[PDB]
Every structure is written in C-alpha cells, then in structure tokens.
Amino acid sequence: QDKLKQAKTDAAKEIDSYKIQKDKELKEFEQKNAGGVGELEKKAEAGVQGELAEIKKIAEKKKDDVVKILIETVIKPSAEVHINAL
Amino acid sequence: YGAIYSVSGPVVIAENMIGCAMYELVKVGHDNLVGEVIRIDGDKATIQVYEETAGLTVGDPVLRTGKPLSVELGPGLMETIYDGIQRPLKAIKEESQSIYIPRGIDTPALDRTIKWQFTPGKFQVGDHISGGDIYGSVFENSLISSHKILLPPRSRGTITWIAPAGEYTLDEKILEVEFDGKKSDFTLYHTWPVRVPRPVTEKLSADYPLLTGQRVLDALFPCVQGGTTCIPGAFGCGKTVISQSLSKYSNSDAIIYVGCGERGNEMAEVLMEFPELYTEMSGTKEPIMKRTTLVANTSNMPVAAREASIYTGITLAEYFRDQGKNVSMIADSSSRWAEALREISGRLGEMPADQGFPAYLGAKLASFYERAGKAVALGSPDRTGSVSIVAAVSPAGGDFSDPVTTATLGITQVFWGLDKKLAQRKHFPSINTSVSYSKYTNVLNKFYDSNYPEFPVLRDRMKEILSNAEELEQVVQLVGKSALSDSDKITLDVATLIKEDFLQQNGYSTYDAFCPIWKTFDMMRAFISYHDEAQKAVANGANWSKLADSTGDVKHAVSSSKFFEPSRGEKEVHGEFEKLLSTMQERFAESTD
Amino acid sequence: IEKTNIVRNETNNIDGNFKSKLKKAMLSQQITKSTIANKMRLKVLSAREQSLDGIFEETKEKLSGIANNRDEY
Amino acid sequence: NDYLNKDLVSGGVVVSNASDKIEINNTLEERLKLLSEEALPAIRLELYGPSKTRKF
Amino acid sequence: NKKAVEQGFNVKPRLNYNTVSGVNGPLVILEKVKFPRYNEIVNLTLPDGTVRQGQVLEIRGDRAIVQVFEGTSGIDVKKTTVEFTGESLRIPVSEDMLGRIFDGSGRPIDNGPKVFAEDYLDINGSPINPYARIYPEEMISTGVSAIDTMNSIARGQKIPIFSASGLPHNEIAAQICRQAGLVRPNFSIVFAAMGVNLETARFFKQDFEENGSLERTSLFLNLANDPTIERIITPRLALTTAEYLAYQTERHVLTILTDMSSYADALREVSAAREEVPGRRGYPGYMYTDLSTIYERAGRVEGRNGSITQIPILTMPNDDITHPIPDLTGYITEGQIFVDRQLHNKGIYPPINVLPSLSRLMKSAIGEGMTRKDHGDVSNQLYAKYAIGKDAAAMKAVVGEEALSIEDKLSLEFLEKFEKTFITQGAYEDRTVFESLDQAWSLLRIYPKEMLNRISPKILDEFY
Amino acid sequence: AVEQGFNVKPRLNYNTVSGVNGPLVILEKVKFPRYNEIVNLTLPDGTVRQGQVLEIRGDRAIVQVFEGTSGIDVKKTTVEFTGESLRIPVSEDMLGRIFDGSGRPIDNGPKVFAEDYLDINGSPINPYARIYPEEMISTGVSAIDTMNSIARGQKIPIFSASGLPHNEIAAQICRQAGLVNFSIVFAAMGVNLETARFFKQDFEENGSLERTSLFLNLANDPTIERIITPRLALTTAEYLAYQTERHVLTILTDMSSYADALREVSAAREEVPGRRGYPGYMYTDLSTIYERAGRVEGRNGSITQIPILTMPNDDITHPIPDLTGYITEGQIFVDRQLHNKGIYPPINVLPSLSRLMKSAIGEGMTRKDHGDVSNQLYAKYAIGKDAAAMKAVVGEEALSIEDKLSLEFLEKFEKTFITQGAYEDRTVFESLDQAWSLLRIYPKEMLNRISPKILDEFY
Numbered sequence A: 001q002d003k004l005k006q007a008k009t010d011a012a013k014e015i016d017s018y019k020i021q022k023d024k025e026l027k028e029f030e031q032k033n034a035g036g037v038g039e040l041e042k043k044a045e046a047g048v049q050g051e052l053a054e055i056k057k058i059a060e061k062k063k064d065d066v067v068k069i070l071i072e073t074v075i076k077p078s079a080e081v082h083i084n085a086l
Numbered sequence B: 001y002g003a004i005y006s007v008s009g010p011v012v013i014a015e016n017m018i019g020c021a022m023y024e025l026v027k028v029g030h031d032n033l034v035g036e037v038i039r040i041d042g043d044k045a046t047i048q049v050y051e052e053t054a055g056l057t058v059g060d061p062v063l064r065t066g067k068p069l070s071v072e073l074g075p076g077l078m079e080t081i082y083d084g085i086q087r088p089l090k091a092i093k094e095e096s097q098s099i100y101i102p103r104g105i106d107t108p109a110l111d112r113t114i115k116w117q118f119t120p121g122k123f124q125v126g127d128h129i130s131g132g133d134i135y136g137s138v139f140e141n142s143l144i145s146s147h148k149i150l151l152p153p154r155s156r157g158t159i160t161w162i163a164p165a166g167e168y169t170l171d172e173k174i175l176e177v178e179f180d181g182k183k184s185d186f187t188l189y190h191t192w193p194v195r196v197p198r199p200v201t202e203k204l205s206a207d208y209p210l211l212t213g214q215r216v217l218d219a220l221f222p223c224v225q226g227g228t229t230c231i232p233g234a235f236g237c238g239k240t241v242i243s244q245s246l247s248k249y250s251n252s253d254a255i256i257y258v259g260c261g262e263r264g265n266e267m268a269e270v271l272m273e274f275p276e277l278y279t280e281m282s283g284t285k286e287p288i289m290k291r292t293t294l295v296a297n298t299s300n301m302p303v304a305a306r307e308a309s310i311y312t313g314i315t316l317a318e319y320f321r322d323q324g325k326n327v328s329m330i331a332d333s334s335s336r337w338a339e340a341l342r343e344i345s346g347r348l349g350e351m352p353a354d355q356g357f358p359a360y361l362g363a364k365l366a367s368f369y370e371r372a373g374k375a376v377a378l379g380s381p382d383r384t385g386s387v388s389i390v391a392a393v394s395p396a397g398g399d400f401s402d403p404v405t406t407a408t409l410g411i412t413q414v415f416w417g418l419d420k421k422l423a424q425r426k427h428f429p430s431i432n433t434s435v436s437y438s439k440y441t442n443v444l445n446k447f448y449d450s451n452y453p454e455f456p457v458l459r460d461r462m463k464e465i466l467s468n469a470e471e472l473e474q475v476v477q478l479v480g481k482s483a484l485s486d487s488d489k490i491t492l493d494v495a496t497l498i499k500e501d502f503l504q505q506n507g508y509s510t511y512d513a514f515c516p517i518w519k520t521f522d523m524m525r526a527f528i529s530y531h532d533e534a535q536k537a538v539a540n541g542a543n544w545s546k547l548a549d550s551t552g553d554v555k556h557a558v559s560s561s562k563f564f565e566p567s568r569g570e571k572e573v574h575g576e577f578e579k580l581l582s583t584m585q586e587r588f589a590e591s592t593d
Numbered sequence C: 001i002e003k004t005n006i007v008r009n010e011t012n013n014i015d016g017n018f019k020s021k022l023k024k025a026m027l028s029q030q031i032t033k034s035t036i037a038n039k040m041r042l043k044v045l046s047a048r049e050q051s052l053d054g055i056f057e058e059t060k061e062k063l064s065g066i067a068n069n070r071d072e073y
Numbered sequence D: 001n002d003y004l005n006k007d008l009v010s011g012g013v014v015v016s017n018a019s020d021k022i023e024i025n026n027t028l029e030e031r032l033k034l035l036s037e038e039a040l041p042a043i044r045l046e047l048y049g050p051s052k053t054r055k056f
Numbered sequence E: 001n002k003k004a005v006e007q008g009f010n011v012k013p014r015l016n017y018n019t020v021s022g023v024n025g026p027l028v029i030l031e032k033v034k035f036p037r038y039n040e041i042v043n044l045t046l047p048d049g050t051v052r053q054g055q056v057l058e059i060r061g062d063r064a065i066v067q068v069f070e071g072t073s074g075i076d077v078k079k080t081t082v083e084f085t086g087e088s089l090r091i092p093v094s095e096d097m098l099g100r101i102f103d104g105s106g107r108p109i110d111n112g113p114k115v116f117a118e119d120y121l122d123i124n125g126s127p128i129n130p131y132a133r134i135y136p137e138e139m140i141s142t143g144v145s146a147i148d149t150m151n152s153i154a155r156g157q158k159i160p161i162f163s164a165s166g167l168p169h170n171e172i173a174a175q176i177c178r179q180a181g182l183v184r185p186n187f188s189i190v191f192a193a194m195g196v197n198l199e200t201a202r203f204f205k206q207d208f209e210e211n212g213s214l215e216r217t218s219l220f221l222n223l224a225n226d227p228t229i230e231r232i233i234t235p236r237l238a239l240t241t242a243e244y245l246a247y248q249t250e251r252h253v254l255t256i257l258t259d260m261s262s263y264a265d266a267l268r269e270v271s272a273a274r275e276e277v278p279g280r281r282g283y284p285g286y287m288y289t290d291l292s293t294i295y296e297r298a299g300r301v302e303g304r305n306g307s308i309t310q311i312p313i314l315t316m317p318n319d320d321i322t323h324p325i326p327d328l329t330g331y332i333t334e335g336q337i338f339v340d341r342q343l344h345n346k347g348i349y350p351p352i353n354v355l356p357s358l359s360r361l362m363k364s365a366i367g368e369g370m371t372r373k374d375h376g377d378v379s380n381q382l383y384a385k386y387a388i389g390k391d392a393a394a395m396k397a398v399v400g401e402e403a404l405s406i407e408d409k410l411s412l413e414f415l416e417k418f419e420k421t422f423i424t425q426g427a428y429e430d431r432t433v434f435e436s437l438d439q440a441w442s443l444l445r446i447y448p449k450e451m452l453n454r455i456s457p458k459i460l461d462e463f464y
Numbered sequence F: 001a002v003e004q005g006f007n008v009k010p011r012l013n014y015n016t017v018s019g020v021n022g023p024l025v026i027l028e029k030v031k032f033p034r035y036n037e038i039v040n041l042t043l044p045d046g047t048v049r050q051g052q053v054l055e056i057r058g059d060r061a062i063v064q065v066f067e068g069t070s071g072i073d074v075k076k077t078t079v080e081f082t083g084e085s086l087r088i089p090v091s092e093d094m095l096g097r098i099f100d101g102s103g104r105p106i107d108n109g110p111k112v113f114a115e116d117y118l119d120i121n122g123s124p125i126n127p128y129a130r131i132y133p134e135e136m137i138s139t140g141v142s143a144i145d146t147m148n149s150i151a152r153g154q155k156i157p158i159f160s161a162s163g164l165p166h167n168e169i170a171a172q173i174c175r176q177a178g179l180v181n182f183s184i185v186f187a188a189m190g191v192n193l194e195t196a197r198f199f200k201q202d203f204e205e206n207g208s209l210e211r212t213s214l215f216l217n218l219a220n221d222p223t224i225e226r227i228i229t230p231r232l233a234l235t236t237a238e239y240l241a242y243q244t245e246r247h248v249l250t251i252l253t254d255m256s257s258y259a260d261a262l263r264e265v266s267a268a269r270e271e272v273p274g275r276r277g278y279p280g281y282m283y284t285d286l287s288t289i290y291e292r293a294g295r296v297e298g299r300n301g302s303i304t305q306i307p308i309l310t311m312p313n314d315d316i317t318h319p320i321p322d323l324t325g326y327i328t329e330g331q332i333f334v335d336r337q338l339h340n341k342g343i344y345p346p347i348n349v350l351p352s353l354s355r356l357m358k359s360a361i362g363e364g365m366t367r368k369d370h371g372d373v374s375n376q377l378y379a380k381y382a383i384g385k386d387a388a389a390m391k392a393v394v395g396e397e398a399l400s401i402e403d404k405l406s407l408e409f410l411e412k413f414e415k416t417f418i419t420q421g422a423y424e425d426r427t428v429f430e431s432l433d434q435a436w437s438l439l440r441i442y443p444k445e446m447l448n449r450i451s452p453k454i455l456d457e458f459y
C-alpha cells in the first residue's frame, strides 16, 4: 500500500539518517584530514626545512667562486664586429 | 594635434600624427569626433571614429587625448541611457533641444550637478588602502542603495585625507592618497579603459542559477550567475524579447542592457516599460529602471560605435560586479558588433578571413565573453559579485553556421538556440530543444539539491520525453501513426502537451510573463506526473483512446496550470498545484478502475 | 510488496549519499595533501631563487666597487 | 649632457648613434642583468651538482 | 522668428576642378583638390554639356573619388569640369512638396516649377535619439484582416511587404494607403519608387490620383530606365521629405519604398564597383547599416505630433526569406507582411502567408484599450491553428486523409475556411478590426472550447 | 659543462618603430636583422612585451608581439633585439608548476631555475633515430582502447566540436593512461577559464600536479601567445621525455584556437591565404607542432601527444581538422549526435581511427582477438548505421534479418559498450569481453571479419 510504503521508507529513512551521520562523520574525517594536513603542513615544513638548510649551506660554500666568475664576465672585454660586417 | 589625410567611410587616416599609440582616443575634425587609432603607418595613424564622417575635410585637426577609450564609472549611470561612447542620451536631448544626436557633442558621461549623499567607509585617515577597496558609499537611488564607491584599481597608498559624511558632486574631492611622496586626489567617479578588463581577486566557479523567468530557459537549459549565454536565431525568433524578459525578471541585482545594431524602438520600449515594472527585491516595490542602465547604439548610428557600446556595457557590468552586485550584461546583438567589425576591417583593407569577418573576430569574442564570470572583487572588504553575459547572436540567413555564431558557441557555455519554425505560429519562446544545450546543469545540481531536489530528475525526464517524441514524430511523418504503439501514443501526446503548455510561455500575458522557479518546478512535476500516470494506466491494460476520453478533464487541468498567477504567492499556488496533482491521481485511478 | 520497494529505494539513496560524501571527503583530502606538497616545493624553489638572487645582489655591490677603483675602471 | 642615474647605474656607458634612435645599454648593471638571465644553467651547474635525472 | 534665413543669405563660390586624375567604373577620381570634403556633392560637367551630380566617397590628400549617379559614360579628362558645392546632398523641402512628382534625384518631373525651398536638409539624415523616440502604440486599421488581426501595424511601425516578383504586392500596398486609418481617432503618403517598371509607377500614380491621395503625396520616381546609382539616394530623398513633413510639420506620413530589392541591387553594384567586402550573396557587408539608415528614419519622437510609417515593398528573388535583402530587412524593420506565391496561385487576395509575417509593435498597440480585449489571444490562437492546419495538410498529403485524427480534420476545415473567408478580401473591401475579430471568433468556434489552449480562460468564457 | 653561458652580449635598443599594424610591429632601421629573433618592446607605459621577428627586409623587421600591440606608440617605443630565437628555460623541477602562455610562472612561484635554454622550435629528429611505438596505452575508455588503440608515442588528436565533452574525455584519458607513471605537459591555448579550472582541478584530484606542467593561455590572454604556447609546451615535453627519460603525455587543447591565431597573424601579413583564410603553410606549422611526438632510438621516453581539437561546425573537411588528420596519426572523433543522444563518451568510432592500432594491438601484446574484434565491431556498427538510415528512409520491414540484428547491436553498442561513466577504468581485456558479448548477439555464421580460429576459440 502507499501508506505502508511511506512507513517502510520512513524506517529506511532512519538508516538514511545514520548514513547522513556517516556522511557527517566523513565530513568530520575530512576536517580531521585537513587538520592532519595542517599537522602534515608542519611536517612538510619540517621536511622542507631540512632540504633548504642545504640550500643556504650550498650557496655560501660556492658563493664567492660564482661571484668571481660573474664579475670577471661582466667586465671582460668583448669587442667583435658582426660577422656580416667583417 | 595632427591633420587629416584620408576620410574613407568610418576610418580616417590622420597625417603628421607621430606619437599616437594604438587604441588611443583622438578627436578627429573640428567637431571633435571621438575615434580610436587602429594602425600607425609612420606619421599616419588610421582612426575609426565613433561618429558620422560626413563633412570631414582634409586638413581638419586631430587631437591626441593620450588616453584609451575610457568609460566613466561611479554614481549616476544606474538609471540612464548611453550612446556607446558613454554619452548620456537624456543629457544630450536636454542640451541640444533636438531629437537627433549632434555630431561630436561632449556631454559628461555622469551628471556633475547632482549631489550624492556620501557615507565614509571603514577606512580612516592613515589606514593603507589598495585598489578596489571600498572607502565609502553613496545613495544612488531607492533600489541601488549604498552604491559603494571603489578606489580605482592600479592605485594604492596611504589615506592622507578622507571626506566626512555629506553631499558631494563628482567633481569634489572625496579622498586623498599619498603614494611614494605623491598625493593623489580621488572623487566619487573614476575612468577605466574599456579594452582592459577590470581586475578581480580570483574568479570563482558560478553555482547559483540566473533565474530568467522563462520556463524553458529556467528548467531545460539553465544559466548561472556568472556564465556566458548565446541566443542565436533568425529575425522574429525572440532573442530580443527573451533578453528583455531576462532583464526585467532576473534575480540579478544590476542589468546592463547593451544595444548594438538593434532598432531604437526597442530602446524606447525598454525606457517606457521598465519604469512601469516593479521589482519585489529590496523589501519594497521599486521600479526596474532603478536597477537597469542602457547602452543604446541604434543600427543607423555610426558603425564603429558598436564595439564601443559592447565594451562600455561590459565595463559597467564589471564595475557593478567589483561592487559585489550580481550583474547580467545583455548584448543586443554580438552579431551586429561583428558586422561592424567586418565593415571596419573591409574599410581598412585587411584579409577577409571567413565570410569577410576579420581573422581576429574569434579572439575578440573570446575575450569579451571571458570578461564574464563570478569573481571576488579586488579589495577589502571581501565581496563576491558576478557578471552574466546573455548575448543574442543574430546569424545572417538564419543559419547557425555563421562565423560569429560558431565563435560565440565555441566560447560560451549556454546555447539557447531559436527555431524560426517555432518563431512563426507564435510558439515563443522558440527555443529549439534539440540543438539547445546548457553546460551549467552539473554545477546547478548543488542548488537543485539545496532547494528543489527533484528538479534535475524531472528536467531529465522532460528532455527524454521530448527527444523520444521527436524521434516518434519523424517516424509518424514518414510512415503514419498506425504503426506506433500505445506507449508511443502517450509519449507523443504528453510531449505535444508539454510543448503547447509548458515550453510555450507568452511573455506578454499577465500569468506567464514571469514563471518563477517554484512555479516551473511545480509545472514540471505536474506534466511528468501526468505522463507517468498515463503510462502506468496503459501498462495496466487500459486502452489509450478511452483513457484520454475519460481524462480529458485532467489533461485540460494540467494544460491550464500555466494560467496560475505567480502573484498569488508561493504558498497559495503550490497548494493549488498539490490539489491539482491529487485530483489528477484520483481521476486516473477512477478511469483505470 | 510496495513497502519493500520503497524501503529498498530509500536504502539505495542512503548509500548514494554516503558514497557521494565519501568521494567528496576523499577528494578534498587529496586536494589539501597536494596543495601542501605544492606549497612545499614552491617554498624550496623560492629559497633557491632567494639563494640565487643573493649572489646577484652581491655582484652589484662588487661591480660598484670596481667602478670606484679608477685603476681598473 | 643627460648623464645616467647615479643610484641605478654603477658604471659603463649607453652608446647611441647620432640620431639617438639606436642605443646600446652597456652599463655594468645591464650587462650583469644579461649575464644573470643568460647564464642560469652554468650558475646552477656550479652551485649544485648536475641533475641525476637529466641524461644526454 | 526664424533665424535659418540669415545663414541662407550667403554666397559661396565653388572651385571648378578641370583636374580629373582618372576614371574607372562609376568612380571618377580628381587630383589637386583643395581641402576635399567627405560627401561634397559635386556638379560634374561633361564635354557635351551634360551636368551629372556626384558625391565624393574617399578623399586622400589632394584627391577625391567621386561617384556620379548618372554614370561616368562620356567623361573625358581634358574637357570635364567638376565644381565642388562644399556641402553634402541637400534636398530642397517645403510643405508644397505634397502633390508634386519628382525624379529619382528630386528634380520635378510633374511639368511644374522647381520646389520653392523652405529648408535644405541633408538626405543622409541623422539618427533619431532613442531617448527622444516614442514607442508606437497607436494601431492603424489598414482594413485588411491579415494585417490588422493576425499582425498589427502601429503608427510609427516600419513593417515592410515581403513578396516575390510577380505577386500583387503593389496592389496590397495601394490598398493599405487608401484604407490606413487610426483604429480610435490624414496620412500624407511619401512614395519612393526605385527601379520599378513604368507599369508599376503608372499604377501607383493612377491609384493615388483616383483615390485622391495625390493632393497629399510626393512621388520620388526612379524607374528602371533611370540611372542605377541614384537608387541609393532616392529613398534618402523621400525619407528626408517624410522626416521633414512629419517631425518639422506634424503630419502623419506613410512612406512606401517600392523595390527595396532594386535598391539593394544598386547597393551591390556600387559595392562591387569598389573593393568592398562581399558579405553574403555579393551584397556589401555594410548593407545592414545602409538599410538601417533607410528604415530607422521611421517612428515617432517626443513632443512632435508627426509620425512616419515605412512600408517598404521588397522583391525576394526566389521567394526565399533567407536571401540577404529579406533577412536584413526583417532584422532591421519592425515586422514584415509576407505575400505568398502559394496563396496567390491558390487564388487568394491578399496572398498573405501569415506564418512568416510578424509585427513587433502588436505587443503594445493592441490590447484592452486600443481595441477589444480578446485580440491578442485570438491572434495567437489563430496562428497556432493555422500552423496546425498546414502541418495536418502536409500529413494528409503524405499519409492519406484517413490517418488524420479528429483534431487534424478540424484543423484542415479551419485552414480552408480561414484562407478562403478570412484572409481573402476584395481590392476595395475594408474591414474594421472588430469585424475581423468577430470573423476570427467564428473561425475559432469551429473548434470546441477545450482545444483553444492559447486563449486565456476569462477571455474564452467572455467571448465564446 | 656549458661554460659558454657565462657571456654577455649587449643588445641593440631600436627606437626606430613604424608601421604598427594589428599584431605586427615594423622597425624601419635595423642593423643586421635576424629572422626568428626575439625582441623586447618597451612601451611608453614602461611594460615590456616579447616579440618574434616574422620577416626581415634589407633594414626592416616585421615583428609580431605576443602580448599584443594595444598601446604601442611609434615615438616612445624602444625595441631591443635579444639576438636569438625564443629559448624557454627548462628544468626537472619545472614539473609541478603552472605557466602562462609565454612560459611565465602563474602559481606565484619563482622563475624556472634553468637547467638549459632550449629552442622552442626544437630540432628535427632523424627519422632513422625514431622508434615505431608499438606499445599500447590502456586509456581505460572502451571506444578508444578496443577500437582505436593509442600507442605510447602516438600523436592521436581528439576531434570534437563546441560544447562537446572533449575536455572531460581528455582529462579522463590523462587520469587513466597506464600501459596495458606518466608525466603530463598540458598546453591551454585560448580555452575558457572554466575549462582551465576543470583541467587543473581534475589533475590535482587525480594527483597529477606532482608530475605535470600547465601552460595556461586563457581566452582573456593575448591572442598571439597561442602561437608560442604549443611550442613551449612541446619543447618542455621533449626535454622531459628525451633528456630526463620520462614518459610525457601532451594534451595541447584548442589547436583550433592555435590555427585561428595563425590565421590572424597570416591575415595581418597580407600573404596568399590558402583555404578559408588559414595560411597556406598551416600544414607545415601543424606538422612542426604535431611531429614532435614519438620515441627515439637512444633514449627510452616518449611524447604521447593528444592534441584536443574543436571542429568549427563539426566538419572534418574544415582545414584545421583536415590538416590535423593529415599530419597527426589517428583521430578520436567526438560526435554531436552521440552527445545529444546522451552517450558518454560521445566518441563516434566510424570516423575515429588509429594508424598504430594494427601494430600495437593483438598477437600477445594485449590479446589474440583484439584486432579481429575491433574490425568486427567497426563493420557491424557501419552496418547498423546504414540499416538505421534505410529504416528511416523506407519501411522498417524492408530491412533484412541481418539489418535488424545490426540495429539491435547498434543500440546495445552505443548504450552499453561506448557508454562509459567517468572514472570507470575498463581494462582492455574487460572491454574485449564486453565487445564479444556484443558480438555474441550474432550467430557465429555472420561474424565474417573474425578469423575462424579466433571465432571458434572465443565465441
């Protein structure tokens, strides 16, 4: 019957409410994932701090050698006409 | 100030004008005709003027403004009519005392005599201010209250002086910014170049529907607030009336109705009817004209001014978006803009590309339609406006294979194609349900789930019914109706009912001038329920002819549901639709029994 | 008969809603996980750009010193 | 007579022809900018070891 | 009183340029021109003494590309003398133009005097300010049911007459002129023939003379023998006269522009003479604008009691709506009256196929105040049932008459008694819009009350 | 070691500008102009724009400005000749970044710390140094994998029309492109921001931003950078696939927009048009773009180029789809009729073709019956279309028994086999089994294009 079908659907709607609670729990899990990602953001930043620690160290070790090449090139006499002009 | 070297049609090559940039506004002739530089061939600089070139003589001076074609943004425009170069037509009429637009009249775009009540914003003296930040607001009119005054983009610095609350004209200083030791004086208005789009913080995905009011447009092929739209069709199909009804009854807060290559009597009809119409928004009955501005460029006006009208309208829409208002710009005919482009290109002598339309037409259309979109404005406080572009492409010869139509469909997201076979026999809206599509249904699924959950499934059922009955109509036109099964007969009858009653919406009757979202949903529910009930009754074994004879009353009640007044309110009419469905179910059950 | 069909239909809708929410929750976790990974990569690339620009900022100071010395300028 | 800005330019010249239409910014700042934009692979190879992924 | 006289009492010498650089097609190019204008109508004197008018079209430095309306033929470099008037083409207008027959270029061929000008107005005109316009809301009872009930012509409407070559469009246009009148209360006709036959021009002139309209009609006749370049200016001259008589004189004016197909053919010839864009079917890309500057001179304006109604008479080449002239004219104008070869062959007069016909200005200008309440619903229902009749006739042709349903049979009966009794009229029969609506209600009462789905329930109850 | 990088070459700033016409800027006096040279136009407003020298006269240089010529003065504009063709800075870390149309960062990140400067036009690969791909890609789409297979290293475009889900189909192919992980180089040429956001969101959700490079040239972006974006993306792909030995899948989208940009530049140059105004050398330009896909002998790594294309009016005969079919190998045809019927993907397998399927499909590579099953499906689908046309034109009863069976097969084929929901990821073997289930509709007798041994072993 139509009335009985609605009552049976209402009973299944309780499972839908539980499914909605599970959907809300999934949203809470997504918020927990975002919160965990926020903790992972600190973890990623901690991992990034390890890598870019070498970046500062690698620069200073070979900085003065690169400047010597850069300075010698900017000033180097480069006087040559176009090939076509000859 | 350079001279004139050639005047051929709407282009004016100006000699001895070294130093004029591309798209720089110039004043060609002694009457100071406004024009834009296209080419720069050395000293010469080809100019497309936005006025009639008759009477121009070789040697007439051409002044270089040094600025691009700039629209004037601020309080004032909301309820006015413009002329593409943004010359207020009302002010022109009062100043000239003539029914014709004078050549080279230089009336200010925004009235300076009016004093606007300015209320300073949250920014105070000494607080840093960036581009697009709201430092105040003015009372434009009853409907557009608190017309938020935006600091111009590309301008930043520290507020040294801000005017207190009071009444100010547009010439008076409102705010002073010091940047790198240089003081900048800002007023209630500011000019912006129409070619360069106004900056936004970040364009967002449009998710709220643009309620056109038309049943077919709202249900079958929905459009969002921030989505581009195209309405191709021959003359008399209904693109102009669809656009006008959309401007009248849309949920958009501001309307920028742009007339390019459209007859001036349509602009007169808008100017006459919109004040009579009233908007239920803002908590009180306020005239539609208080939230609609017109950029009118009649077909007989200068050819080159159609592009200026398009850009002016879209820039006004972008400004009202940056204020946070959900705007919907409506081009009268992007196809007429494209025809103007073709005329200018042919006058120049460029390569015809396809059908004579210049090779950059597709790119220009793509840029203009990409101006639209929901976006967060540039400065604090945070706000989220939108610009929908409902542009009515008008193909030449009624064939959707025109270059302008093809480029418009490539760039747009919604196709409200119009069939002339339905334009005739007065079946407006003449939306060709077959070719028409809307790619915003997926993003509108969220809104439908929020408000009307069964809207997408009912709409899909209606589309399936219409497509199946189109196939059956081809079959019956080929080999008669004797072969069709019973369920085929019900499909054909219900689809004919849908086309005659639901899809066919008279925009000039009291009842169907504006079918709201809830009424459209109820009508789809009624028609789909009628189809389902007939299908179930026939599957139970009842003969379709006898069932139709018995349920003619129910069919007439369903077909007459379009006469229900939306003015009666959602609660009253929805009760009427529920009673209609209950009586329909009882009648079908009685007929089956 | 009708009661069983209605209950099954409601149960199917319940599963679909949970599955749709699960997909959205999983994708949103992936979006944030990739964004943090993307931000970290742009954090070290920018630092290398800062490291590179640190050398160039010094050479401008060194070049100015050369110009001051009229012996070699 | 129009000399270069002391703050922005550290040295060098900006040679131009008689019409002053064709000029060559040979200032040390401009030459350092060209070197910075054109020697990035060499600077990267000197600062950091060659990428193990990039064969050939 | 009037200060326009003071500027009139000025004499301006005109430079006679014997320097003709060259000539090609209809374009004659001058050299060493001193400060050329952009539309200065010149007086080009032939070696034989013939004086042809021409207007410059493109003016490079010390050069002006004149096109002559009568044709280059006979133009010689050594002997031609071109004088620049210094002003664009200006028609000498007055209230005395009414009752005079003019040539294609406005020269009086009525064997009478030259028009005693009251003002000189540029033929190109100016766009009417849309803020100064008034939406035409005053219905004109043309007396023919197919145009009054199915469609509807307001006072400022510019509805043309789409027709083929052999159809009686001329007889319909003359019927409208002899019967046009406000539904709820005369029209000074301004007639512009462009490339029409001598028979057509004679028919129009005789109709006006016999109906008495010639006392208030100013013909601008451009026959087929007349030069094909002044077909461009003939509608401009007639529309400038109409704009004068309407706006600056407060006279309601019917402007009948016959053979706009001939006007557009002249336009395509002029464009092809140059290196213009080919548009579609060879017509210039600017054709729409040109036809706009023609048609959009109609309409009413604020504060001036005059009005201009334009009834252009088109000649579709193959009776095709998709052709550029009908397509552009439908896009610009405010409707159309579709004269049908199918109905003409069937023997119906007027042979108006109402389905392709339309009128934008029915929406307002029909309703409860202008006419009776039922008109809009009746027209919509009549359109729907006429289309159902045509579709059911096609279905009958395809699958025999037995397969048709009761609705299809009723719709065929409605189609027959609608084309035979409602559309059909005598050449001199004028029907009041109320009588036409009553006939329409008879045709709708063919149907049962249930099938009239486009009729509002209140109107249907009050009028069935 | 590239020690030649440490070298300064001063550049000639030309203030001699004239003839600024559309996308084209003309310099009156240039000292030894170089063809295909990059210039830097410094506007009077101060903003710089790169430009490419399209043609050189004795002292002239017709420059095309990528960012457009809007605002270019003839007096205060200075043009600086860089002295070399456009070289994008490429790197291994360049993966995972979003770029503009001209290879400029968009993700608010630093400029690419260049590992080498590679020319946009690349170099012409020795045909003797190429490898025939013969390595099928399990694209996960039934209508593709089963009937028009894609081999790793095959330039197979997706022919589509306006409004069709070509973006969705290409995003699906990119998301699920394992062999029977891929790096991705995505080039957006004039696509709308909605499409660009869809592609970026889908890549990020699938987890592709770790190994992808987007060159987004939106519709609002200048219309001449569509000429340069595919070349930048393709040389990035060439780097990533040949020098870093990765497997790159290039998804150049709106090649129709690229061809419109070409026509716009060609029209401004006032040269001999060709067909529909598109430049006569459009075949050469499209071949230069497309032919940068495949495998090389020494280096294991490929560019599985999939250039999405949009037919202006769903017409193959249009110059862009026609030349793309001429050069690019294969084609995936997205059908407006199928999309209107509601099928996803709306791939029409009659125009869809793959030249490398016959060699990358079957004989133990995927399964023994792949090629014969795909031939049978194509033949019976063509029979079904012809029978549907015949049943529409004439009476249904006039159709033969085979025609009626083929109509039933066509229904069950469009509605079940081609119809594939997004994220379904059908294996090639599962698609073959489903295709056989479709082929079991017919009696064994009329499966004529199936080899009898396979017919006995799989029916």
Ligand SMILES: Nc1ncnc2c1ncn2[C@@H]1O[C@H](COP(=O)(O)OP(=O)(O)O)[C@@H](O)[C@H]1O
Pocket: B234, B235, B236, B237, B238, B239, B240, B241, B242, B428, B429, B505, B506, B507, B508, E331, E358, E359, E360, E361, E362, E363
């Ligand atoms: N929704 C509608 N309701 C009633 N009439 C309509 C509707 N849409 C269009 N029309 C009719 O179509 C006619 C033609 O106007 P329209 O086709 O909109 O102009 P255009 O040719 O520019 O599209 C109008 O007279 C109007 O009466």
Ligand SMILES: [Mg+2]
Pocket: B239, B240, B262, B263, B332
């Ligand atoms: Mg219109």
